[PDB]
Design a protein around this ligand. Sequence first.
Ligand SMILES: CC(C)[C@H](C(=O)O)N(CCNC(=O)c1cccc(C(=O)NCCN([C@@H](C(=O)O)C(C)C)S(=O)(=O)c2ccc(-c3ccccc3)cc2)c1)S(=O)(=O)c1ccc(-c2ccccc2)cc1
Ligand SMILES: [Ca+2]
Ligand SMILES: [Ca+2]
Ligand SMILES: [Ca+2]
Ligand SMILES: [Ca+2]
Ligand SMILES: [Ca+2]
Ligand SMILES: [Ca+2]
Ligand SMILES: [Zn+2]
Ligand SMILES: [Zn+2]
Ligand SMILES: [Zn+2]
Ligand SMILES: [Zn+2]
Lengths: 160, 160
Amino acid sequence: FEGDLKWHHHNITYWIQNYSEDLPRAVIDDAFARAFALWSAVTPLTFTRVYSRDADIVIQFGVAEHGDGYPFDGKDGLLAHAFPPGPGIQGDAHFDDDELWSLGKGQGYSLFLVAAHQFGHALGLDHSSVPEALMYPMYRFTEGPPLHKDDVNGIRHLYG
Amino acid sequence: FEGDLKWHHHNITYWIQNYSEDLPRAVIDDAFARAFALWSAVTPLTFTRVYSRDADIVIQFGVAEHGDGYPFDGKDGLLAHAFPPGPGIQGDAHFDDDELWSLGKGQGYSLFLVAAHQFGHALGLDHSSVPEALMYPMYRFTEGPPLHKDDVNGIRHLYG
Ligand SMILES: CC(C)[C@H](C(=O)O)N(CCNC(=O)c1cccc(C(=O)NCCN([C@@H](C(=O)O)C(C)C)S(=O)(=O)c2ccc(-c3ccccc3)cc2)c1)S(=O)(=O)c1ccc(-c2ccccc2)cc1
Ligand SMILES: [Ca+2]
Ligand SMILES: [Ca+2]
Ligand SMILES: [Ca+2]
Ligand SMILES: [Ca+2]
Ligand SMILES: [Ca+2]
Ligand SMILES: [Ca+2]
Ligand SMILES: [Zn+2]
Ligand SMILES: [Zn+2]
Ligand SMILES: [Zn+2]
Ligand SMILES: [Zn+2]
């Protein structure tokens, strides 16, 4: 509630600028697609993968300094970040490639879960006080449906 | 916090209820004393160690669910928590003993710097937006003085 920053059109586009070596390109594309699908279902927004610098949400993996002014910190600590909606850097989502990206139970962080969390930020969502919620600021691996009442109440407040 | 929760007396008392086995008791006593020393310089408050359950700030090391419905999660993730000022549970500071507590550069998390962050919450400070600030909610080890302008502006907003 320093805003509320939101997108001002429904058909949001995204560009996967570059890839991590941790997973196959196809797997990465799918993790990101699944992560948008979670928000797609609960909002009037649609997400279209495009191959253009002019996409609303540009996705990159970057280690340390990746030229937006906000260095990653090597392994652990900061996992990723996303800028709230608006023009340019705003809306973009950056994943620290000093982390080990994976999917499923085990090593590293689920690219899916972390992307779903970053994309909530890329839609204008802040952190939730609810510990189970996707937008709670602490990563916990879960096999369960990632969205909870508080996440859905949050986007509904913005787009609903 | 909610309505700027703050203490309404100047002589704040604390009780170290139990001890982690990670460090000598004497080192633990001194780590916590130093953490209070940092907030006493910039505030009207003084902190007196007492040996009573009626202390304002009760300090304890615990694991998982530990009595307050706000459970810890084993090694890593959540490090500690403290409650804003007020009666009973309010003001108290809990340290996850599934973490390794240490001092200096190396293993584990510095009890001194974590205590200092927790005690700022136990005085009524919320999280800071400024990544260097002691009240920034990401642990980074540092040898430099812990307080930054944002922390001290925060405490002065509460206690003048
Ligand atoms: C803003 C970004 C750069 C980014 C993000 O959230 O997008 N990240 C920043 C996150 N940090 C925060 O912005 C933040 C904001 C508000 C609150 C919090 C927070 O409350 N964390 C818990 C704080 N802890 C306690 C406390 O601070 O007293 C307490 C409230 C439980 S703590 O135990 O974790 C803790 C304690 C002490 C300290 C400490 C700090 C300084 C000195 C000494 C100690 C730090 C943390 C964290 S991140 O770390 O790379 C990240 C984290 C989680 C996810 C995620 C992925 C999938 C599913 C769910 C989550 C993705 C990315
Ligand atoms: Ca953008
Ligand atoms: Ca990192
Ligand atoms: Ca990686
Ligand atoms: Ca923990
Ligand atoms: Ca108390
Ligand atoms: Ca321990
Ligand atoms: Zn970035
Ligand atoms: Zn977040
Ligand atoms: Zn507790
Ligand atoms: Zn904190």
